[PDB]
């Protein structure tokens, strides 16, 4: 079987996993204890099965501090995960990459790997890893890169896809988050196969505009992220003739080294509070994928060039409707492809429509789409982060915190230089 | 096309940058000059699998028979993405030498390799593929069963008639539709007789199919 | 990151340290016998930060003066402190830094480290240390900076924070104070993570100019200190999104530039705009520096009470756009705001300000001038050099303090361009 192991690093990663696994359970008819009473066995790629019929997530949760995973251990999903899958330290990385990578990270790396080995040993054909984390946290940034490096050694010839939280300029968020972001991107670059960025400002804007939550919480955003994650993992968890499995998906979306940062766009995002909602057609949900308001990362794709574009539909969607919707977009939109590329659109269809989370903010829809675009427009998100890094780095502010935690200052310069090269790559592919 | 770019891209296949190499392999596929065939054949042996996969895809796009044995070798690759691109290319080239190695690919651990190998066999249209694609109609993945039913309709051998009739009673709504479509593609008195017997005994979709077929023949 | 070990040295240290415990023990619902007699479950949530379980302070009370032991135990909350945690000498330093740092202080320090060791062992996860002392005397100054270094030696990976009271002629007429203040600043520049600069000149000025207390006592000054200390440690003591190290990472861009200008507002209830306006006001600062004479590198703001978060976020953004020039452009998102639902006793709503402003060089400049005048003449030099210390130590303390002032100027002048 084509099994996947999920790794949830730090607060963002762990809390996104709670939302993901709550959704996967509901989507496959699994109770929070792992019991399943209600005909497809494809979900077995994500859940191991006990002899009694308890389905356990093929997931690991790592944090350098206990508070966040302690809520998983005492929460509604306490019986769902095995206690060995939930790993916690004592002292966190204090929003310092060098603590998560060197100093504190080195004290937890070998246990995490052995716990992943116990999961891998229960796989008939481990296909890949899905890694969840923030750019801005010291664990999210530092520990993820250390682990990505070690997974390349232990597995190497196995896919490693990321779901990353791109930092928003919010008053709670650390000052050094632009540093942590550039440092983790540098060290994970040659170790990841794909990275799906989720800009918190974008999700916050969607929650405010579409769900009308003036002050969205992490639960509001994570429930929305987990919908996008579900769309990307749906063909791995469901049978269907119209699926696009992992190697057709990755080979076509992210065919090149380095430039593997697709822009994700999701539609529809409807409020549960709406007294009436006209069901949206394939045309409408596809059209919304070309609207910058529905983007996971804030950038202008109309001003960039595409290398690949994948449409992952779910629900009541017919192949001909998708072709008709694509045709309208070709005549109406500015969908310029790079002049050395296939110019196509990879299309996937899953039969199960989105699942509604009880108490959630999203309304029940018949169809949904997550478009993934390998666009040069993602470099706009890189430039914003790189500018924020540059302002501080010029005066070498906060850098002593890092060098005091097993890091050399040159690692920062080396990191920024690799970002410069990444930004030039997107520019060169655009010409 | 531009001859100055071709020779630039061919030189870029030996560049130290894995990104420069893979884009160069991809670009030669788009241009499609016969001069890029031997350089791309050497790029199938590259250390980097993203370069190997891009070298495979490009060879399928140019479609020169020289690349048939190099691509057959690439079907044995550690990486499923190289295997996928090699299987796809072989279908585009459409050389019979590729049939038995593609029949082997119908039993691959990777479901995208299986799916693509079946459509490649249907593209070549060789008879040696009929009994293995008939066995591929009993695959765990409905997408592999979809490609196999579709490939059988493309070949048009009547050994596929009765297995396609059972495939109308498939769990997946789209495998059922692809089986009915394949039957129409095959045509002939062998399917008109199968429809006569189905329109009298069969139930559900399978009966609907049969009844409709008779309305026209 | 949970438990904090508190240390109080000398007269100033023990008096300001005792008002801190009196204030937060009332906030946490603890009576002078250490029994919890409160109402909110939120009061006992983060209790394990400053208390050990009846609740006892994780406090070490030090002085070379044995008289201080009775003064604190005879105070309002004097019966809560651990009897074993009182480390007292046989004779006070007589405002001699060398006596606290090398002679009489270095004799008692090992006994102090025994107590710190014992309290750090009954710690699930030690965050760090917090010292209350004066830079003007001999004990809190000399012994206190010796203790800082001795703890840095044993616990190098723990946060070291201080509430250091800066000497002022307006408050103490003792001549040698600039020596003690300059010699301590030299130690604090190297061995602390965060130093909250409580300037006796600003304390006097607030009592004089705003409170209209023309002839204030130490009890009046300490009321301002207790309220500031209570507000700066609010997020550590009550549940919020936190810890010593995370705060230090956000507030300290340069290792040496770790001296903060604290503030408190108010000094009928306020509105959030009126609170934000007052907590950034020069007159409300606990260090005698004009904020308009520098740029803010980083800012931490703590609002206490029942108020709109939309209002505080709005008011902290305008305070910045209407005054962009006074904030460093090369540190994006440098102003951090925090809200706590529990207000301090007597106040319906309050605001505590922590500023890392380049204008704090004015504080050091004032001490340097005072030092220079004395040291050139080599006035009272033999009291120090006799106790075993060198004249070079005075020369190094002087160089260091002028370099710190030059460093503050370079970042004040540094532009993003
Ligand atoms: N969407 C989302 N973002 C989150 C969540 N929690 C934190 N973040 C973001 O992640 C960044 C903070 O990093 P964290 O994940 O909390 O840090 P960490 O991995 O625990 O690292 P340390 O606490 O330093 O050890 C900020 O940009 C937050 O806005 C969450 O549940 N969801
Ligand atoms: N605000 C404030 N300042 C104080 C207090 N007590 C003393 N000071 C100031 O601190 C300096 C004197 O230091 P002390 O605390 O008395 O000295 P010490 O640390 O006990 O050292 P020795 O007396 O030499 O043993 C002067 O600047 C005083 O004005 C107090 O309760 N509050
Ligand atoms: Mg954390
Ligand atoms: Mg005294």
Numbering used by the authors:
A (entry chain A): 1 to 38, 45 to 437
B (entry chain C): 11 to 227
C (entry chain B): 1 to 44, 47 to 55, 60 to 247, 250 to 275, 284 to 360, 369 to 441
What does the paper say about this structure?
Microtubules are hollow tubes made of parallel protofilaments formed by the head-to-tail assembly of αβ-tubulin heterodimers (tubulin). As a result, microtubules are polar structures, with a (−) end where α-tubulin subunits are exposed, and a faster growing (+) end, terminated by β-tubulin subunits. We present here the selection and characterization of αReps that target the tubulin α subunit. αReps are artificial proteins based on a consensus sequence of a HEAT-like repeated motif initially observed in thermophilic microorganisms (Guellouz et al., 2013, Urvoas et al., 2010). In this work, we have selected α-tubulin-specific αReps. These binders prevent tubulin self-association by targeting a surface that is involved in longitudinal interactions in tubulin assemblies, with different implications for the two microtubule ends.
The X-ray structure of tubulin-iE5 was determined by molecular replacement at a resolution of 2.6 Å. The structure confirmed the 1:1 tubulin:iE5 stoichiometry and there was one complex per asymmetric unit. In agreement with the selection strategy, the αRep binds to α-tubulin. It targets a mostly acidic surface that is involved in tubulin-tubulin longitudinal contacts within microtubules (Nogales et al., 1999). It interacts in particular with the α-tubulin T7 loop and the following H8 helix, and with the H10-S9 loop and the S9 β-strand (see (Löwe et al., 2001) and Figure S1 for tubulin secondary structure nomenclature and domain definition). The titration of tubulin by iE5 led to a dissociation constant (KD) of 270 ± 75 nM, whereas the same experiment with iiH5 led to a KD of 95 ± 15 nM. The different binding modes also result in an overall surface area buried upon complex formation of about 1650 Å2 in the case of tubulin-iiH5 vs about 2470 Å2 in the case of tubulin-iE5. Indeed, in the complex with iE5, a different conformation of the α-tubulin T7 loop, which interacts with this αRep, is observed. Interestingly, although the α subunit in tubulin-iE5 is in a conformation intermediate between that seen in tubulin-iiH5 and the microtubular ones, this complex displays the largest tubulin curvature.
